[PDB]
C-alpha cells in the first residue's frame, strides 16, 4: 500500500527473446510502476531495491568458447544515458551429450529519480530457460 | 531520508587488494554510516539488510586445486569478537588457455547494535576482477 512495487517473470510463449509479463499469478505491478517496452519505469524518486535472476540451459557444449552475461541498466531521464548498475559474467563450458544448467542472480540498492527506466538484459537468448515458473524474474521495491 | 544506507564498490585504481569506495557515481553512503578502514559502521541499532557480490576471473587453471571464498563478518562493540554472518565457497577448476569467470553473491537480514563493524572479505585478491562497473560491491540498508 502506497509503496511502488514490481515483480515480473519471463514470457514462456516466446522464443529467442525475453519479454516480461505482469498478467500472471504470483507477479506484481502496483502503485505507479509501469512496464513500457520491456522496461519498468520509476514513478517517484527515492531509494529502491533492485533484483533479477536468470537461468541458462545448454545441451552438450559448443566447439567454441561461450561467455554468458546478465546485466541491469539504468536510463536517466535527464542527460539521456545508459549506465550499468549490476552485472555478471559466467562461462559454462571448460572443454570440448548431457545438459548443463547455470543460474545468475543480481541485487542491490540504488537511489533513482522520477521517470528513470530500468532494464535487465542478456546476450544469448537462445540459451535461456523459461519453461518452468520462478526460473527467470526481475523486480524492484521502493523503501 | 533518515534511513542509514550504504552501497560501495571496489577500487579499480588498486592491484592485488580490495578497497571500497564511496566517491563514485551510483554509489551511496548516507545517514550516519561510515567507512573507516575498509569497514562499514552501523550508526544505530536495528534490523539491517546486508548484501555483497564479487567476481573472480582466471586465465587457464593452476596445476594445484584452488578454492575461493567470499565472507561477510561482524565485529561487536562489546565483548570484541568476529563472528561469521554469511559465507560461501566455490571451485572453478577440475583438470589442468581460455579464461573463466565465477560470481558469488550473499545476502541476508540481521539485527545489529550501534557501533558494530561489518566487513566483506575474500582470500585470493590476485584473482579478483574489478575492471568494469557493478561487478564487485557491498552494501547495507536499514529498516
Amino acid at each position, epitope marked *: 500500500s502506497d509503496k511502488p512495487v514490481a515483480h515480473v517473470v519471463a514470457n514462456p510463449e516466446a522464443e529467442g527473446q525475453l519479454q516480461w509479463l505482469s498478467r500472471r499469478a504470483n507477479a506484481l505491478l502496483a502503485n505507479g510502476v509501469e512496464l513500457t517496452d520491456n522496461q519498468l519505469i520509476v514513478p517517484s524518486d527515492g531509494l529502491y531495491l533492485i533484483y533479477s535472476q536468470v537461468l541458462f540451459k545448454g545441451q552438450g557444449c559448443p566447439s567454441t568458447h561461450v*561467455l554468458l*552475461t546478465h*546485466t541491469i*541498466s539504468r536510463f536517466a531521464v535527464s*542527460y*539521456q*544515458t*545508459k*549506465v*550499468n548498475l549490476l*552485472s555478471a*559474467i559466467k562461462s559454462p563450458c571448460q572443454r570440448e551429450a548431457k545438459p548443463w544448467y547455470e543460474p545468475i542472480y543480481l541485487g542491490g540498492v540504488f537511489q533513482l529519480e522520477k521517470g528513470d527506466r530500468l532494464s535487465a*538484459e542478456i*546476450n544469448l537468448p537462445n540459451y535461456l530457460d523459461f519453461a518452468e515458473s520462478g526460473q527467470v524474474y526481475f523486480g524492484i521495491i521502493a523503501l | 531520508s533518515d534511513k542509514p544506507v550504504a552501497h560501495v564498490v571496489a577500487n579499480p585504481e588498486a592491484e592485488g587488494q580490495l578497497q571500497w569506495l564511496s566517491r563514485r*557515481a551510483n554509489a551511496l553512503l548516507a545517514n550516519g554510516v561510515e567507512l573507516t578502514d575498509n569497514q562499514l559502521i552501523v550508526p544505530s541499532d536495528g534490523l539491517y539488510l546486508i548484501y555483497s557480490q564479487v567476481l573472480f576471473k582466471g586465465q587457464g587453471c593452476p596445476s594445484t586445486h584452488v578454492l575461493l571464498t567470499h565472507t561477510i563478518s561482524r565485529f561487536a562493540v562489546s565483548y570484541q569478537t568476529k563472528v561469521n554472518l554469511l559465507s560461501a565457497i566455490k571451485s572453478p577448476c577440475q583438470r589442468e588457455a581460455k579464461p573463466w569467470y565465477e560470481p558469488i553473491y550473499l545476502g541476508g537480514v540481521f539485527q545489529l547494535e550501534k557501533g558494530d563493524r561489518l566487513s566483506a572479505e575474500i582470500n585470493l585478491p590476485n584473482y579478483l576482477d574489478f*575492471a*568494469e*562497473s*557493478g561487478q564487485v560491491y557491498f552494501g547495507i540498508i536499514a529498516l
Partner: nanobody
Framework: VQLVESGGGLVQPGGSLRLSCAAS????????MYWVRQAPGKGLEWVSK????????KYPDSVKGRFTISRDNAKNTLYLQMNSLRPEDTAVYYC????????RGQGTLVTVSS
C-alpha cells in the same frame, strides 16, 4: 567530454572501411555506446549499440550482417568495422552516448561512390 571521430574516406562498392572514436571526461567503462549515422536529406538513425562489457551488440535490419562494433576500455576507444558497402551507406557518422544522438563532438563522412 568530447568524442573525436576519424577513418573516413571513399570506398568503391564491395570494399571495407573502418571508423573509430575516442572519449574523455567520463568513465568510459560505464555507459553504453552508440554509432549513429546522419544521411544527407534523411533523418538521424542509430546504426550500432554496445554495452559496458562488450558482449551485447545490436544492429538494425538495414545494416545487420555487414557491420562489426567493438570497444577497448583501457584506451577509452570505440570501433566500427565496415564490410561489403553499398551506396546506401553514404552519410556522416558520429559516436554518441544515446541512439538518437547526444554528445557527438564531430562526425566523419563516408561516401560509397559506384
Amino acid at each position: 567530454v568530447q568524442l573525436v571521430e576519424s577513418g573516413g574516406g571513399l570506398v568503391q562498392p564491395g570494399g571495407s572501411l573502418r571508423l573509430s572514436c575516442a572519449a574523455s571526461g567520463f568513465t568510459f567503462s560505464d555507459y553504453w555506446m552508440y554509432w549513429v549515422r546522419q544521411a544527407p536529406g534523411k533523418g538521424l538513425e542509430w546504426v550500432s549499440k554496445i554495452n559496458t562489457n562488450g558482449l551485447i551488440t545490436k544492429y538494425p535490419d538495414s545494416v545487420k550482417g555487414r557491420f562489426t562494433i567493438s570497444r577497448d576500455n583501457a584506451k577509452n576507444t570505440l570501433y566500427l568495422q565496415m564490410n561489403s558497402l553499398r551506396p546506401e551507406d553514404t552519410a556522416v557518422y558520429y559516436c554518441a552516448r544515446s541512439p538518437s544522438g547526444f554528445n557527438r563532438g564531430q562526425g566523419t563522412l563516408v561516401t560509397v561512390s559506384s
